[PDB]
Amino acid sequence: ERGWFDILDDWLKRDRFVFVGWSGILLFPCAYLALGGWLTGTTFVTSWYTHGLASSYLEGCNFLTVAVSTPANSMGHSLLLLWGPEAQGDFTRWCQLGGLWTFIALHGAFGLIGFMLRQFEIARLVGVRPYNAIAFSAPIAVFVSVFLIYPLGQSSWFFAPSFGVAAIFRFLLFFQGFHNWTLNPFHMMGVAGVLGGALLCAIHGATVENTLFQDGEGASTFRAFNPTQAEETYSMVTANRFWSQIFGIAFSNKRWLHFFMLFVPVTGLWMSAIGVVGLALNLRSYDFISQEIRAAEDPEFETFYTKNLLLNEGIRAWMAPQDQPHENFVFPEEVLPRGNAL
């Protein structure tokens, strides 16, 4: 009625510079620790024992090459808890075994939940509809699919992305060479949603800025807007005529337009995640069987599809020994696939 729960609720929801909320109790520690763990690892922590790599400012890496790298393949999918059976409470050993990777991935996961809870909590307090939270389901689906589901289908967390600029690039190239991920229609739908979203961002911003009403005397036109004004700041009718005449179609309904801006990139991300769930199981779009039957029988038959697989075979042979050290691969010079001269 007027108890401690309600009093705490009061405090949590004060209108302050940084809103806290009930969601804050989860979000703030988890986000802080994920970010702090990343900065700590990239600054000070090696990947020598897990990958045979230097990965920190301390060892001489730069912003592009530092990473918090995944644990050794031999850890499997161990939670790698500081107090767990691998590190046994030893912070130093924990760092050397890749404990910061699961630390960051798991605090990061709970942090994202906290962020989406925050979006809901704030929306509810201000009295708006929770579409921003709904939209953030896409980043969640990507994070969960790539950082958790993908390695969980594979042998170990080793094969998740390492948290690093160059490390992420390595993850892209791994996916090309091993999964032929460019060929996957779920990735392609991803691409279209991201590029489509970027397109819509650009085109909507430019259209509004180029159909503005003259609402001031200034040549710099930003000051001629008042947040509380009733009227549209740009002409939908002129925008609509322009696009109808240039491109053939145009938006006529502003609510539809802004919904579509949610739908496109959110749907794209969600499709890309579904594909990565298949890659967890090596369930790839690697091949077109009809192409392979023809090419095997007809040594004159060549497409860009066949050309790309040759590239993929190069990637795998040339990168595997150093990228997968636990396999102890030794590939004699003579077995390495190479074209003429190169």
Next chain:
Amino acid sequence: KLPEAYAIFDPLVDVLPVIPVLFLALAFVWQAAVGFR
């Protein structure tokens, strides 16, 4: 190398080419001083 007589000025010569960039940055200092009015 510069002629030997000018060698004392080597460290100064190392710095000069960057000066034009400082004029861009200066425009900002100046505008901050007048409040970006």
Next chain:
Amino acid sequence: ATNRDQESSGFAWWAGNARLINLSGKLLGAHVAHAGLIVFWAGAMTLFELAHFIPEKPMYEQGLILIPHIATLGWGVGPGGEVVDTFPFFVVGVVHLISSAVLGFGGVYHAIRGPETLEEYSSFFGYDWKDKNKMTTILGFHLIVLGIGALLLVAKAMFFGGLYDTWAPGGGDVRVITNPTLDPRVIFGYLLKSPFGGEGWIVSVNNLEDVVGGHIWIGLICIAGGIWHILTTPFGWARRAFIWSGEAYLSYSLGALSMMGFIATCFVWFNNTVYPSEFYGPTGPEASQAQAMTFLIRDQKLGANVGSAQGPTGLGKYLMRSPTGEIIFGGETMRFWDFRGPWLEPLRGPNGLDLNKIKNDIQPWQERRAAEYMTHAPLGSLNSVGGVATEINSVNFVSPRSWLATSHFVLAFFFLVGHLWHAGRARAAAAGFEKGIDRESEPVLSMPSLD
């Protein structure tokens, strides 16, 4: 503080230079101060380059872009492009740096102390952008100035010691140009050449006689054009075609500079006459040709019959035919058969690369040069690791040709964007809707519906 806030000028701080459009004295200062910045950099950068210059390494191993421009004019160099005297480089650097002080002084004075408008001070120096005759006058003065500059090049090449000629008989050397090409069929012929492969429009210019002759024409064309523009006012058809405003004029020049930038990019990427490879390093095509030359020489020394050696594809491993039959190097460098360079031309006969010349006439200097150019190809990383993208750290090299082509592409591109921005704005401002649509006179609302 005249017109130095948003409320009085109509322009925010981030468009603050637009506050100068109709303030001829302050705008003169901005322009003169800017010219000072350009001249300062030319001077300072040269002295930095000279300070950092080791005479016995190639210029192109040393991140030099300005010393090579001075050397190409025949200053400081001798046979093969060897540096014989660095003093001309020092002089150019010092005189530019000193001159920049003078330009900076004038610029600062006109910008913050002098009359903010010039029109009530002087009818000669003042101007209204919309006065078509005064604009063509000032344009005319500047054309005369530019024509005199083009004739300075001519004077250097013909009367004051010549230019560096990579093509000079018996080896590159500084050479005086006594017979500049005046024939307008040749000079204007470059202008009507295709820009595509094997033609290359003006970028194909391959001898100093044509270069000098070209500047004789340009200098005379520009001086004549300047007199013309001083002595006339724009005709009716031009009055009706253009927007007449300061921003419109800016736009036209941005367009022009964009175009010039893309041309300069192509010039330094392909041309090895006005950008001698001795100073700028080999062109991309040149280095690829040089690799084929290198291995042809090596394998022929070992006993290979290079004309008859069939490669894996069935094409000649070393030598093949172009689509019109000329004998060219094989491998991927088939694309570069239009390359021409002084180290390779002695092997060329009427039907292309000559097998008897190849078998008998290749000199050690040609082997050296091909090896040099193959191993200084214009490939390298942003942090200046020379070679292919997979090469290991070791060699600190990015070709001056890559620096110059990339920078000028970037700049030409953004200048095209600026052309579009300012031309579109000039149009809208002239017609009166650059600040937006009048709510009470929205043009589309008076038009019939599309359907």
Next chain:
Amino acid sequence: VIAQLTMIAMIGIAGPMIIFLLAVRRGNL
């Protein structure tokens, strides 16, 4: 090391010094 850093320090301060001197004098900024 020290010569180059001292130079760029005096050249570097010159611009802000000009603005500072003028602000102090209520100059025509």
Next chain:
Amino acid sequence: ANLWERFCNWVTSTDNRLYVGWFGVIMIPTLLAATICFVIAFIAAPPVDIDGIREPVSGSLLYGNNIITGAVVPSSNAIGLHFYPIWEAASLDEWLYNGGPYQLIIFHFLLGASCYMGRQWELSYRLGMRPWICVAYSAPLASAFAVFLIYPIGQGSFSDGMPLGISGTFNFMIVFQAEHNILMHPFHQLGVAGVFGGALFCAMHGSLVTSSLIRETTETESANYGYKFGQEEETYNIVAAHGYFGRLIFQYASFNNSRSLHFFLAAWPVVGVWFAALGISTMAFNLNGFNFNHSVIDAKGNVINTWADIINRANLGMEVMHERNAHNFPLDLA
């Protein structure tokens, strides 16, 4: 009015269902030529000797491709940068073998798309709009220039232009990575920030305006009916949207000015994509991604790999396998 006057009035008419205009006079024929050739070639073109090594690559549906593998294949390396119009071939059969359709399509397209940009300026002018939509379109346009014209110029062949096809595109990407380490180039990184950020801000803007739509409908109808085309009143409450977003982050991280917001929405993707385009256009002249190969060395001099060295191994795979019969000499110099 005379005929020319009447014709000019029609071309520039604000009442045509699709605007023509002077730009359109060039755009319409060039785009139609590029389109018709592309469609026919994609369906029915025979194999093309892309690499000039008499090794023809099949791009068309009728010659064993599906939508994903299909392409119009770049012109032959034998041609390089030479202009290869139909009339320079002895026959259409030769024209086809050598990849003539590619050149016809990309040249007509680049001209037409440049005129599409001009046309956006032109109509904005006729309608009394501000002029800069065309400037936003310069970003994708510059990118198409980069992959179809500038990169070929730098490398000396239209054979290295991006193929007109889905798998062809991926081939271009993988070889570009091998040759330029594009992933490690800050201009492609800016490009990524541009498109990931464009997508993020697209979703964010859409979600925030959708969040704050004013109640004008009942539960059994689409909220979209709450907006009528051309109504004067804004249809969402920006004060509420800002109230929300400013609390999500903090107040001064949220836009309360719609003009400033919509400018940011334009600028972020456009500028990033301009850097993407400039990445391709400058790697065209082989100023490549950052190379930290063997940058970390121990006290003895042993190489201590970083993630850059692992990238390098992948790149090597691509390099050694690409165009497997085309290189005779040890270095791939273009």
Next chain:
Amino acid sequence: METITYVFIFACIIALFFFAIFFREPPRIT
């Protein structure tokens, strides 16, 4: 059959563009 199917889908898309442009619901002001 494969080729026919691809071309058929494409041609339907092209027809759709035509109807979406020329036979759109016309936008009407209030």
Next chain:
Amino acid sequence: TTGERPFSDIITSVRYWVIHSITIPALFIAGWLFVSTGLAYDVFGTPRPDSYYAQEQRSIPLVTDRFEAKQQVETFLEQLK
């Protein structure tokens, strides 16, 4: 406005800089010494430049046993000296 002192007031005040002219350089120096004393290597288990390999070894000390991993790392460390 949410009740807290404006940042611009705070960072243009003399008292802010009296405090922060001490605390900022104190923190920076402490971080410097964390590295310069070698403490960072010890806390995090990061090899120094002389501690990636034994003198004649050219095999990475990769962890291959999940539950004995701590002991493996320890044995690897013993092998250096």
Next chain:
Amino acid sequence: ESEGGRIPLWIVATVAGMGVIVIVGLFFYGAYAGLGSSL
């Protein structure tokens, strides 16, 4: 003593900005020297 405005904001910005440039510069210097230099 703690009156807001005593140190002008343009000076705080300039000095802070210069500090950022110095530390970032140090970091670029370090790309060419010592660990990570390739040498």
Next chain:
Amino acid sequence: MTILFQLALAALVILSFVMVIGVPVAYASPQDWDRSKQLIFLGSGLWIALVLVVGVLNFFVV
């Protein structure tokens, strides 16, 4: 002449730095424009002289 040179050149650098600060400050300053203007004249002629001196003396040290 080397002592003369090296000094003349350091004097030129020092004067340059003085002018670089002083000229803009003078131009934008409300008071003492009379005195300032004379000094800028002085500094300018002295700067030019010193350039010519270094320029000449260059040849007797190089």
